[PDB]
């Protein structure tokens, strides 16, 4: 099964500049020759150019919306074509409003694909329940069928048609919601394992359930949207909203070494990793490693091992 790897050095959808540079670090670590030794064939898109919205007026308190709205546009044309070759879709984030266009784009192919979401947050916030207005933190209330019509038609927005409905996605990680955002998940009925299902199950028991709820009646297309800060940030730093008590690194590769298993993985974001906020030179290397590691998991390196077939060792 064919990989195409999608740049989206892209910033706008938070106040915080940097994230656009995440592409070229983990490129920098040599991310797309690693893949390439994986059982996959590799293709890279290169990173998409982004052309930047003059005069992009705050629409209400919804900052950067036309440029956010463009950039995510352009990202779903791009991945629903590489979709329609029936290749997997990995695009290496800037920041998570970038799914928007990731996801919607993966919908147009895979109209009955479910999402995994690891994140330490939600990005629920509407227009509406937005503290800040940065679209970063609104990337599923653009995506959600059941929010269709709760807020204001953004500008740069109207190419949108709400992809997956409330039932189709799964959080992992949840550890630091808005009193919004939690009434959202709760009204909308999302299924979640929040840190404290995830102390309470385990991880592993964690990902049981999370397959049967996704694939228990039908077998379908898994979009894993990975935003890096839904691991502890001992693990991973150089991200904008880091929050104390995260997915452990391990939970981490296990969470993509069962997704792998599953043989449905048909769409990866990879989000949020900003090489400029790492304390240390050291933070950022312990980020890129953490993200390329991830990636790797999800296309099939085992922690315990792996070996060419028809090949005799010894
Ligand atoms: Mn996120
Ligand atoms: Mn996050």
Known sequence: ??????????????????????????????????????????????????????????????????????????????????????????????????????????????????????????????????????????????????????????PGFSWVTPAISAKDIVYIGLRDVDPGEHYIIKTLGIKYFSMTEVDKLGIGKVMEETFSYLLGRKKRPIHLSFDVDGLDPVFTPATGTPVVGGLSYREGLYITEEIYKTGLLSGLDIMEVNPTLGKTPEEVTRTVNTAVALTLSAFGTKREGNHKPETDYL
């Open 1 to 154: 099964k064919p990989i195409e790897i999608i740049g989206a050095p892209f910033s706008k959808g938070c106040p915080r500049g940097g994230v656009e540079k995440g592409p070229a670090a983990l490129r920098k670590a040599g991310l797309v020759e690693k893949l390439k030794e994986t059982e996959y064939n590799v293709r890279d898109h290169g990173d998409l150019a982004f052309v930047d919205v003059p005069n992009d007026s705050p629409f209400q308190i919804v900052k950067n919306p036309r440029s956010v709205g463009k950039a995510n546009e352009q990202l779903a044309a791009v991945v629903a074509e590489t979709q329609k070759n029936g290749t997997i879709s990995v695009v290496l984030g800037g920041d998570h409003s970038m799914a928007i266009g990731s996801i919607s784009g993966h919908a147009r192919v895979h109209p009955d694909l479910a999402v995994i979401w690891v994140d330490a947050h939600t990005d629920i916030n509407t227009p509406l329940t937005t503290s800040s207005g940065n679209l970063a933190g609104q990337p599923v209330a653009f995506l959600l069928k059941e929010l269709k019509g709760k807020f204001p038609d953004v």
